[PDB]
């Protein structure tokens, strides 16, 4: 009754990891993910130099999910490389790093340093082309000319299999255009769909005020607001990019929702808002709920239903 | 104590109307909207020739809203033009017509036909630039050069103040570019934010099957899913297009969501998924629920709080 995932030469005990930026900024945070029942983990979307991020308040838990304008608070690339080279326990689970250079020049600089650590430890790169909360910096995934420039430059520079965190698309034409770009880059081996539904706004009727400080209350949305969007993006790139893997991210609160992600195409399944609400104990119950579902449906591996959602 | 809205030279008895697509396709639909307590109504987004729309099933109610790929079912432009000129009762309330020609050429011909009915009767145009459910037709709203052409050409052929139904944007640079375009066209008097979050995917875990037939199950999302997005968009255009009104659309089930929309800058508040659920008696309930909120807060009119959302 296997939850195992076998990708890029690595063995994963189950399909579940943290969403980049939830429980992964500090050494303490990464330790707790390692010690959880998650199949893998990913470090914070990091920058060349350390950042403190946006001013406070910048996070608000919502009845149907979360809004945030974090602003890439991170200990800089040298801290996470160090964690990846010296500290992390690989015999426990593989490690993804997320990198979110604010310019292609910056991203080139950071991936060049990761090359020898990937070689020795097999650390996996997820390149972030979303990042919706940095004031003044637009999401790269929404500019297909600039996306091409990043993939080009990171491909040449990194010279090894990597992945990409994509912003949500909401138009068939966009799915097609994103696809035509990604498929010109054979080193892009996986696509994470999706990041926060960007630039939403929550207002408190009681004091008639926005609930976060940065960018006049505008922040990225997560949780139940995003499942339909996430499922669609995973499925759309599963069909359009068959030489690549899809990782699902968005709206995972339970095993049911993990199951729908896999059904739409997902190899690995990331958890953000639910993980932030419940703590890493969630992984233990996500593993048991997905097993229950597969047991009831008579599925022995993830592979006999991955991508096999039925249409009418 | 008053809910009156004074815009476009017109008096509206309240700010509430139907969203385009909902209870507005047939003569009975439009009579019922007209006999409702709604401040206004809008006809179904029409085309030059009649359409029966996508194959069934094409609408699926959800706990947190709705998913749909209706496909612009409509009795053709001539039907709605005839309704506006001969049937509708303008003493009861003003009328909008939504027009969604599928090419600039189709739209131009349609808008010309309205000119003499607007002049005679005062019928208002909402140019629809976000039809996400017609197979193989991208949402115009997401192409700014295409959007420009539509607005140029409708400005030339129509030559009277009109409005636009926008798709939701999720990037600040997209808000900037949308507004730069809109601000070159002074005949554009109002911006309706927002249309459905396009191309979501719902899968029923029981049968592993999508819940809608068209486009492999991909459809637009209404209801609770959309409220954060609707508010942000409303407020973003409110700030960036100060010489235009903003109309609010998305996630409105009650007095409170109506209050939020207005607070973020909305003049009129359109109601979709909730009106589908409840039928036209929801307009009576929204009038009452909004008056309660205003009474409790000490407000006598909408102008006390419209656009007065507070930041930190
Ligand atoms: C507090 C917090 C912080 C971050 C995020 C989210 C939240 C809630 N997200 C987005 C996250 O990775 C995920 O894609 C979304 O939250 C959607 O997943 P859920 O719906 O929340 O499960 C995020 N994504 C990313 O690529 N890098 C990051 O540094 C962050 N930071
Ligand atoms: C059945 C149905 C049909 C349509 C729609 C919706 C639904 C549910 N919508 C979108 C609608 O106008 C509105 O923008 C969204 O539904 C968001 O509002 P709610 O959250 O649903 O209130 C829509 N919009 C539009 O401009 N013209 C249309 O013909 C339609 N058709
Ligand atoms: O008729 C439809 O399918 C339709 C039109 C539109 O503008 N938006 C939507 O969600 N559906």
XYZ file of C-alpha atoms and ligand atoms in Angstrom:
697
model
C 0.000 0.000 0.000
C 2.740 2.384 -1.134
C 2.846 6.195 -0.872
C 6.409 6.124 -2.272
C 7.582 8.521 -5.010
C 10.664 7.719 -7.136
C 11.992 10.811 -9.024
C 15.405 12.158 -10.106
C 17.126 9.081 -8.607
C 15.774 9.946 -5.120
C 13.419 7.790 -3.024
C 10.587 9.696 -1.278
C 8.686 7.931 1.521
C 5.544 9.943 0.586
C 4.517 12.845 -1.742
C 4.280 15.552 0.974
C 6.454 18.607 1.687
C 6.129 22.134 3.147
C 5.278 24.966 0.712
C 8.388 27.176 0.267
C 8.367 29.936 2.923
C 6.282 28.049 5.553
C 8.303 26.585 8.471
C 11.667 26.805 6.625
C 13.443 30.185 7.267
C 15.606 29.341 10.352
C 17.719 26.301 11.310
C 15.125 25.445 13.987
C 12.348 25.580 11.321
C 14.222 23.144 8.976
C 15.001 20.750 11.856
C 11.245 20.442 12.651
C 10.412 19.683 8.954
C 13.206 17.061 8.856
C 11.827 15.445 12.032
C 8.206 15.463 10.680
C 6.570 12.684 8.602
C 6.935 14.794 5.387
C 8.547 13.001 2.408
C 10.728 16.070 1.752
C 11.183 19.746 2.668
C 12.138 23.035 1.010
C 14.094 26.037 2.341
C 12.736 29.621 2.213
C 12.813 31.452 -1.132
C 16.177 33.188 -0.456
C 18.173 36.187 -1.807
C 21.928 36.895 -2.243
C 22.030 39.144 0.857
C 19.850 38.648 3.994
C 16.471 40.444 4.169
C 14.121 41.387 7.090
C 11.110 41.678 4.693
C 8.000 43.913 4.816
C 6.842 45.870 7.888
C 4.296 44.488 10.352
C 1.523 43.357 10.417
C 2.187 41.258 7.292
C 0.352 37.951 7.974
C -3.345 37.314 8.800
C -4.959 33.889 9.213
C -8.437 33.814 7.562
C -11.470 31.471 8.015
C -10.910 30.204 4.443
C -7.084 30.491 4.352
C -4.383 33.183 4.660
C -3.278 36.594 3.321
C 0.407 37.613 3.546
C 2.880 40.265 2.372
C 6.014 38.707 3.891
C 8.572 40.276 1.524
C 11.101 37.375 1.306
C 12.476 37.549 4.886
C 15.546 35.269 4.673
C 19.052 34.666 6.117
C 20.706 34.991 2.682
C 21.942 32.324 0.272
C 25.053 31.522 2.392
C 22.953 30.357 5.377
C 20.828 27.896 3.330
C 23.775 26.561 1.277
C 25.563 25.980 4.602
C 22.477 24.132 5.988
C 22.399 22.070 2.778
C 26.162 21.241 2.836
C 26.934 20.720 6.568
C 23.735 20.357 8.614
C 20.881 18.566 6.766
C 20.270 14.816 7.306
C 19.942 13.339 3.779
C 19.391 9.762 5.119
C 16.088 11.169 6.466
C 14.772 12.854 3.284
C 15.946 14.887 0.232
C 16.195 18.692 0.413
C 14.857 21.306 -2.004
C 16.116 24.902 -1.844
C 13.986 27.737 -3.256
C 15.854 30.693 -4.828
C 14.159 34.040 -5.561
C 16.815 36.457 -6.823
C 15.233 39.893 -7.461
C 17.197 40.133 -10.747
C 18.557 37.533 -13.199
C 22.137 38.753 -12.380
C 21.415 37.924 -8.699
C 19.875 34.533 -9.586
C 22.891 33.592 -11.727
C 25.194 34.471 -8.792
C 23.214 32.260 -6.329
C 22.711 29.100 -8.474
C 26.458 29.061 -9.378
C 27.197 28.504 -5.674
C 24.676 25.614 -5.409
C 26.353 23.519 -8.158
C 28.990 21.711 -5.980
C 26.485 21.081 -3.147
C 23.914 19.522 -5.562
C 26.761 17.360 -6.952
C 27.869 16.052 -3.528
C 24.513 15.864 -1.689
C 21.963 15.940 -4.548
C 20.263 19.119 -3.228
C 17.379 20.068 -5.602
C 16.849 23.653 -6.911
C 13.343 25.162 -7.174
C 13.641 28.572 -8.965
C 10.929 31.043 -7.891
C 9.379 33.008 -10.789
C 6.408 34.297 -8.749
C 7.228 36.295 -5.569
C 4.172 38.644 -5.425
C 4.952 40.596 -2.213
C 8.182 42.502 -3.051
C 7.178 46.191 -3.523
C 8.129 47.335 -7.046
C 9.173 43.867 -8.366
C 6.434 42.261 -10.582
C 5.991 38.487 -10.906
C 8.406 37.133 -13.580
C 6.120 34.199 -14.537
C 3.687 36.793 -15.955
C 6.330 38.069 -18.486
C 7.116 35.267 -20.938
C 10.058 37.194 -22.519
C 11.626 37.674 -19.049
C 10.740 34.084 -17.988
C 12.680 32.917 -21.078
C 15.641 35.145 -20.039
C 15.701 33.582 -16.515
C 15.435 29.942 -17.720
C 18.107 30.592 -20.377
C 20.558 32.112 -17.882
C 19.939 29.743 -14.935
C 20.115 26.716 -17.328
C 23.527 27.772 -18.688
C 24.701 28.780 -15.203
C 23.429 25.832 -13.115
C 23.919 23.065 -15.733
C 21.793 20.553 -13.770
C 18.136 19.445 -13.488
C 16.019 22.073 -11.689
C 12.388 23.098 -11.144
C 10.368 26.328 -11.129
C 7.641 27.749 -8.874
C 5.020 29.325 -11.148
C 2.374 31.979 -10.434
C -1.235 30.882 -11.058
C -2.510 31.320 -14.623
C -6.219 31.873 -15.296
C -6.373 31.842 -19.139
C -5.994 28.978 -21.663
C -3.754 31.226 -23.804
C -1.461 31.758 -20.796
C -1.223 27.996 -20.124
C -0.155 27.577 -23.789
C 2.393 30.430 -23.709
C 3.894 29.343 -20.341
C 4.098 25.819 -21.802
C 5.877 26.873 -25.032
C 8.539 28.638 -22.887
C 9.078 25.820 -20.369
C 9.341 23.143 -23.107
C 12.335 24.899 -24.716
C 14.316 24.127 -21.525
C 15.057 20.395 -20.948
C 16.892 21.028 -17.648
C 13.559 22.186 -16.159
C 12.444 18.767 -14.872
C 9.517 19.853 -12.683
C 7.011 22.694 -12.306
C 5.394 23.623 -8.965
C 1.787 24.864 -9.438
C 0.897 27.187 -7.779
C 2.119 30.121 -5.672
C -0.249 32.462 -3.822
C -3.142 33.990 -5.745
C -1.389 37.384 -5.742
C -2.509 40.890 -4.720
C -5.807 40.142 -2.935
C -7.303 42.430 -0.244
C -8.994 41.672 3.081
C -10.877 44.397 4.963
C -12.233 44.218 8.524
C -15.859 45.543 8.667
C -15.431 46.335 12.408
C -12.757 49.052 12.102
C -13.101 49.573 8.258
C -9.373 48.895 7.878
C -7.108 46.580 5.862
C -5.571 43.732 7.940
C -1.969 44.006 6.618
C 0.399 47.006 6.435
C 2.483 46.598 3.217
C 1.194 47.765 -0.203
C -2.080 49.266 1.171
C -3.395 45.872 2.346
C -2.616 43.919 -0.838
C -1.136 40.450 -0.274
C -0.978 36.874 -1.567
C -3.899 34.521 -0.841
C -3.562 30.865 0.221
C -5.714 27.977 1.506
C -9.235 27.134 0.300
C -9.373 30.144 -2.061
C -6.815 28.414 -4.338
C -7.660 24.666 -4.689
C -9.605 25.016 -8.024
C -6.844 27.223 -9.460
C -4.065 24.904 -8.273
C -5.785 21.776 -9.642
C -6.305 23.425 -13.026
C -2.690 24.617 -13.322
C -1.253 21.205 -12.318
C -3.524 19.435 -14.836
C -2.943 21.944 -17.641
C 0.894 21.657 -17.433
C 0.666 17.889 -16.910
C -0.851 17.600 -20.397
C 1.236 20.377 -22.037
C 4.626 19.402 -20.530
C 4.789 15.539 -20.609
C 8.638 15.482 -20.429
C 8.370 17.276 -17.038
C 6.962 16.523 -13.571
C 4.274 18.626 -11.848
C 4.263 19.350 -8.084
C 0.868 20.515 -6.721
C 0.703 23.489 -4.291
C -2.569 25.068 -3.115
C -5.521 24.302 -0.818
C -4.147 21.084 0.787
C -5.872 20.693 4.193
C -6.545 16.941 4.035
C -5.796 13.636 2.258
C -8.812 14.104 -0.035
C -7.246 17.307 -1.495
C -3.839 15.599 -1.844
C -5.626 12.845 -3.763
C -7.248 15.347 -6.183
C -3.816 16.947 -6.780
C -2.240 13.570 -7.661
C -5.279 12.717 -9.817
C -4.776 15.981 -11.773
C -1.057 15.177 -12.324
C 0.994 15.939 -9.144
C 4.188 13.997 -8.299
C 4.785 15.847 -4.967
C 2.178 17.842 -2.955
C 3.132 21.013 -0.991
C 1.311 22.391 2.082
C 1.455 26.080 3.139
C -1.558 27.598 4.952
C -2.651 24.314 6.632
C 0.942 23.661 7.818
C 1.112 27.229 9.218
C -2.238 26.644 11.059
C -1.582 23.110 12.457
C 2.281 22.731 12.662
C 4.356 19.794 11.173
C 2.152 17.222 12.982
C -0.155 17.599 9.909
C 2.118 15.391 7.748
C 1.351 12.400 10.024
C -2.397 12.725 9.344
C -2.000 13.594 5.636
C -0.116 10.257 5.214
C -2.891 8.274 6.970
C -5.794 10.016 5.131
C -4.337 9.434 1.612
C -3.679 5.747 2.462
C -7.296 5.364 3.618
C -8.480 6.762 0.248
C -6.195 4.506 -1.857
C -7.149 1.482 0.286
C -10.869 2.253 -0.341
C -10.337 2.766 -4.129
C -8.070 -0.317 -4.476
C -5.003 1.652 -5.645
C -1.672 0.038 -4.639
C 0.647 2.878 -5.823
C 0.303 6.603 -6.597
C 1.286 5.675 -10.179
C -1.933 3.856 -11.019
C -4.028 7.094 -10.734
C -1.552 10.021 -11.099
C -2.854 12.196 -13.976
C -5.851 9.871 -14.617
C -8.708 12.319 -13.845
C -11.725 11.558 -16.090
C -13.362 14.108 -18.466
C -16.883 13.829 -19.983
C -31.447 57.101 5.960
C -30.861 56.596 2.189
C -29.251 54.043 -0.189
C -29.547 56.274 -3.320
C -26.649 56.413 -5.836
C -26.333 59.440 -8.173
C -24.016 58.610 -11.107
C -24.071 58.764 -14.942
C -26.717 61.512 -14.655
C -29.061 58.792 -13.264
C -30.736 58.218 -9.867
C -30.495 54.609 -8.544
C -32.790 53.638 -5.626
C -29.974 51.406 -4.237
C -26.448 50.290 -5.352
C -27.394 46.635 -6.023
C -27.855 44.904 -9.403
C -27.489 41.419 -10.967
C -24.086 40.392 -12.359
C -24.085 39.810 -16.157
C -24.993 36.180 -16.973
C -27.398 35.713 -14.014
C -31.229 36.127 -14.255
C -30.979 38.259 -17.406
C -31.094 35.999 -20.524
C -34.873 35.848 -21.293
C -37.828 38.273 -21.185
C -39.090 36.571 -17.988
C -35.595 36.822 -16.366
C -35.451 40.590 -17.084
C -39.039 41.252 -15.957
C -38.271 39.505 -12.653
C -35.092 41.590 -12.194
C -37.173 44.686 -13.051
C -39.888 43.708 -10.453
C -37.165 43.023 -7.847
C -35.928 45.679 -5.391
C -32.554 45.808 -7.240
C -31.403 49.367 -7.940
C -30.654 48.310 -11.555
C -30.297 45.345 -13.946
C -28.018 44.306 -16.816
C -28.940 42.031 -19.780
C -26.941 38.875 -20.592
C -23.670 39.479 -22.472
C -24.990 39.123 -26.048
C -23.483 38.471 -29.509
C -24.682 39.484 -33.026
C -26.262 36.048 -33.726
C -28.104 33.935 -31.081
C -26.121 31.291 -29.103
C -27.289 28.222 -27.099
C -23.849 27.908 -25.419
C -21.765 24.945 -24.205
C -22.982 21.318 -23.766
C -24.319 20.148 -20.361
C -23.427 19.926 -17.562
C -22.011 23.493 -17.555
C -22.859 24.911 -14.075
C -21.911 23.246 -10.769
C -22.859 24.778 -7.420
C -20.125 24.464 -4.765
C -19.958 24.980 -0.950
C -17.791 28.097 -1.414
C -19.478 29.287 -4.634
C -19.830 28.006 -8.233
C -17.897 26.822 -11.318
C -19.303 27.393 -14.835
C -18.677 27.216 -18.589
C -22.085 28.461 -19.876
C -20.581 29.678 -23.199
C -22.463 32.994 -23.738
C -26.022 31.567 -24.196
C -28.076 34.570 -25.485
C -31.100 35.432 -27.703
C -28.872 37.670 -29.921
C -28.252 41.454 -29.845
C -31.569 42.221 -31.652
C -33.515 40.603 -28.769
C -31.956 42.788 -26.026
C -31.983 45.952 -28.174
C -35.719 45.321 -28.724
C -36.185 44.767 -24.936
C -34.447 48.087 -24.158
C -36.458 50.125 -26.707
C -39.983 48.670 -26.281
C -40.363 46.397 -23.197
C -38.247 47.750 -20.291
C -39.835 50.100 -17.701
C -37.355 52.962 -17.152
C -39.565 54.523 -14.431
C -38.719 51.467 -12.302
C -34.952 51.562 -12.775
C -32.146 52.129 -15.335
C -31.008 49.364 -17.708
C -27.510 48.215 -18.728
C -26.808 45.910 -21.679
C -23.677 43.766 -21.667
C -22.162 43.246 -25.113
C -19.543 40.570 -25.759
C -18.800 40.461 -29.466
C -16.137 37.774 -30.092
C -14.119 40.053 -32.432
C -13.596 43.827 -32.623
C -15.474 43.765 -35.965
C -18.521 42.018 -34.366
C -18.508 44.449 -31.408
C -18.316 47.586 -33.591
C -21.468 46.529 -35.491
C -23.269 45.775 -32.202
C -22.413 49.087 -30.466
C -23.526 51.153 -33.525
C -27.009 49.576 -33.143
C -27.223 50.751 -29.495
C -26.488 54.457 -30.187
C -30.108 55.375 -31.176
C -31.575 53.443 -28.207
C -29.205 55.104 -25.663
C -30.067 58.529 -27.183
C -33.818 57.777 -27.022
C -33.966 55.841 -23.712
C -30.725 56.225 -21.704
C -29.677 52.540 -21.896
C -26.061 52.074 -20.664
C -23.403 49.845 -22.338
C -21.075 47.427 -20.450
C -18.382 46.244 -22.941
C -17.406 42.707 -21.798
C -13.628 42.123 -22.076
C -13.473 38.903 -19.981
C -15.475 35.990 -21.463
C -13.417 33.030 -20.082
C -15.649 30.144 -21.251
C -15.816 30.404 -25.069
C -13.548 27.580 -26.400
C -10.353 28.813 -28.121
C -11.024 32.527 -27.390
C -8.592 34.243 -24.937
C -9.907 36.865 -22.465
C -9.335 40.221 -24.203
C -8.690 41.904 -20.841
C -5.344 40.032 -20.496
C -4.068 41.400 -23.879
C -3.470 45.176 -23.501
C -2.822 45.915 -27.231
C -6.002 43.988 -28.121
C -7.823 45.760 -25.252
C -6.662 49.119 -26.689
C -8.064 48.273 -30.148
C -11.474 47.263 -28.706
C -11.691 50.540 -26.697
C -10.470 52.750 -29.584
C -12.980 51.215 -31.994
C -15.968 51.205 -29.565
C -15.107 54.806 -28.634
C -15.267 55.744 -32.357
C -18.438 53.751 -33.203
C -20.394 54.268 -29.973
C -19.225 57.817 -29.132
C -21.090 57.996 -25.770
C -19.958 57.170 -22.165
C -19.747 53.391 -21.622
C -18.216 50.874 -19.175
C -16.030 47.749 -19.301
C -16.252 44.398 -17.481
C -12.630 43.544 -16.552
C -11.155 40.099 -15.720
C -9.372 39.918 -12.311
C -5.693 40.956 -12.274
C -3.207 39.505 -9.769
C -0.043 41.547 -10.427
C 0.650 45.210 -9.538
C 2.300 45.756 -12.963
C -0.927 44.357 -14.500
C -2.965 46.927 -12.495
C -0.553 49.651 -13.730
C -0.802 48.543 -17.395
C -4.599 47.998 -17.333
C -5.081 51.542 -15.929
C -2.586 53.187 -18.372
C -4.749 51.744 -21.173
C -8.124 52.653 -19.580
C -6.971 56.250 -18.853
C -6.383 56.969 -22.589
C -10.145 56.486 -23.218
C -12.320 59.171 -21.529
C -15.580 57.653 -22.873
C -14.880 54.788 -20.406
C -16.824 56.091 -17.360
C -16.980 52.893 -15.242
C -14.897 49.719 -14.708
C -16.659 46.566 -13.382
C -14.282 44.494 -11.205
C -14.487 41.537 -11.473
C -15.508 38.684 -13.797
C -14.998 35.041 -12.727
C -11.558 33.738 -11.803
C -11.133 31.975 -15.161
C -10.259 28.320 -15.815
C -10.572 26.690 -12.411
C -10.927 22.884 -12.155
C -13.181 20.957 -9.749
C -12.872 17.142 -9.458
C -15.329 14.967 -7.467
C -13.140 12.530 -5.415
C -15.897 9.842 -5.441
C -15.845 9.223 -9.215
C -12.439 10.822 -10.075
C -14.330 12.933 -12.664
C -14.543 16.669 -13.402
C -17.966 18.219 -12.615
C -18.416 20.209 -15.891
C -18.400 18.854 -19.478
C -16.757 21.681 -21.553
C -13.007 22.385 -21.919
C -11.971 19.223 -20.013
C -13.758 20.553 -16.901
C -12.170 24.090 -16.814
C -14.550 26.953 -15.876
C -14.898 30.355 -14.129
C -15.211 30.559 -10.329
C -17.858 32.673 -8.550
C -18.813 33.278 -4.919
C -16.733 33.208 -1.734
C -13.618 32.204 -3.747
C -13.489 35.597 -5.472
C -14.109 38.219 -2.705
C -10.442 39.045 -1.762
C -9.639 39.360 -5.514
C -12.724 41.483 -6.246
C -11.949 43.922 -3.400
C -8.288 44.425 -4.422
C -9.203 44.988 -8.067
C -12.020 47.443 -7.171
C -9.675 49.389 -4.847
C -6.715 49.278 -7.281
C -8.749 50.850 -10.127
C -10.451 53.235 -7.670
C -7.024 54.722 -6.906
C -5.539 54.493 -10.438
C -8.576 55.715 -12.475
C -9.951 58.604 -10.351
C -11.829 60.089 -13.366
C -13.816 56.795 -13.644
C -16.371 55.042 -11.415
C -15.716 51.456 -10.228
C -18.498 48.813 -10.007
C -17.941 45.923 -7.600
C -18.523 42.264 -8.571
C -17.632 39.057 -6.720
C -18.228 37.210 -3.446
C -21.264 39.255 -2.363
C -23.651 37.061 -0.300
C -24.725 39.642 2.337
C -24.949 43.248 3.600
C -21.375 42.969 4.912
C -19.588 41.998 1.659
C -21.617 44.814 0.017
C -20.339 47.261 2.640
C -16.729 46.136 2.022
C -17.044 46.599 -1.760
C -18.413 50.144 -1.349
C -15.686 50.926 1.270
C -13.029 49.916 -1.323
C -14.534 52.362 -3.869
C -17.578 50.669 -5.564
C -20.506 52.868 -6.702
C -22.774 49.896 -7.622
C -22.530 46.301 -6.299
C -23.282 43.402 -8.706
C -24.485 39.976 -7.449
C -23.834 36.663 -9.292
C -23.545 33.228 -7.624
C -25.701 34.249 -4.618
C -28.575 35.445 -6.861
C -28.424 32.128 -8.729
C -28.795 30.329 -5.365
C -31.474 32.503 -3.770
C -33.377 34.110 -6.674
C -34.348 37.825 -6.838
C -35.679 38.152 -3.250
C -31.972 38.516 -2.268
C -32.211 42.217 -3.297
C -34.741 42.973 -0.502
C -32.461 41.149 1.971
C -29.359 43.096 0.823
C -31.117 46.500 1.143
C -32.158 45.643 4.743
C -28.784 44.101 5.757
C -26.839 47.149 4.494
C -29.124 49.649 6.310
C -28.556 47.670 9.542
C -24.732 47.920 9.132
C -24.993 51.663 8.402
C -27.450 52.328 11.300
C -25.135 50.469 13.723
C -22.194 52.566 12.434
C -24.096 55.910 12.430
C -24.210 56.425 8.611
C -27.206 58.107 6.874
C -25.901 57.672 3.252
C -23.364 55.669 1.177
C -21.176 58.755 0.697
C -20.105 58.652 4.357
C -17.987 55.503 3.715
C -17.571 54.952 -0.070
C -13.847 54.813 -0.904
C -12.909 55.498 2.748
C -11.177 52.145 3.440
C -8.271 52.841 5.863
C -4.618 51.674 5.548
C -1.763 51.587 8.163
C 3.602 32.754 5.373
C 3.821 32.403 3.923
C 5.056 32.618 3.351
C 5.287 32.288 2.029
C 4.257 31.704 1.249
C 3.027 31.467 1.832
C 2.771 31.806 3.130
C 1.384 31.531 3.655
N 4.498 31.346 -0.105
C 3.420 30.735 -0.920
C 3.349 29.264 -0.600
O 4.579 28.734 -1.042
C 2.177 28.535 -1.258
O 2.400 28.460 -2.646
C 0.835 29.228 -1.089
O 0.652 29.610 0.277
C -0.287 28.350 -1.586
O -0.294 27.131 -0.805
P -1.442 26.953 0.319
O -2.783 27.217 -0.327
O -1.127 27.992 1.352
O -1.296 25.535 0.807
C 5.788 31.381 -0.559
N 6.119 30.827 -1.749
C 7.421 30.819 -2.179
O 7.701 30.324 -3.240
N 8.400 31.363 -1.406
C 8.178 31.944 -0.187
O 9.138 32.415 0.431
C 6.835 31.970 0.257
N 6.529 32.482 1.472
C -24.157 31.285 -14.612
C -23.187 32.424 -14.784
C -23.092 33.061 -15.993
C -22.190 34.089 -16.181
C -21.376 34.552 -15.114
C -21.501 33.920 -13.874
C -22.382 32.887 -13.686
C -22.436 32.204 -12.350
N -20.504 35.665 -15.335
C -19.629 36.176 -14.238
C -20.382 37.130 -13.311
O -20.774 38.287 -13.980
C -19.536 37.614 -12.135
O -18.541 38.515 -12.651
C -18.918 36.453 -11.344
O -19.897 35.411 -11.182
C -18.404 36.894 -9.989
O -19.533 37.286 -9.158
P -20.113 36.260 -8.053
O -19.036 35.950 -7.049
O -20.530 35.042 -8.851
O -21.277 37.012 -7.443
C -20.713 36.440 -16.488
N -20.139 37.671 -16.640
C -20.411 38.467 -17.723
O -19.905 39.576 -17.835
N -21.283 37.989 -18.674
C -21.895 36.758 -18.622
O -22.636 36.419 -19.543
C -21.582 35.950 -17.519
N -22.153 34.738 -17.388
O -21.295 33.185 -20.730
C -20.311 32.768 -20.136
O -19.849 31.651 -20.212
C -19.517 33.747 -19.347
C -19.209 35.035 -19.752
C -18.390 35.868 -18.908
O -18.074 37.044 -19.142
N -17.940 35.252 -17.757
C -18.203 33.961 -17.355
O -17.759 33.482 -16.312
N -18.981 33.230 -18.219
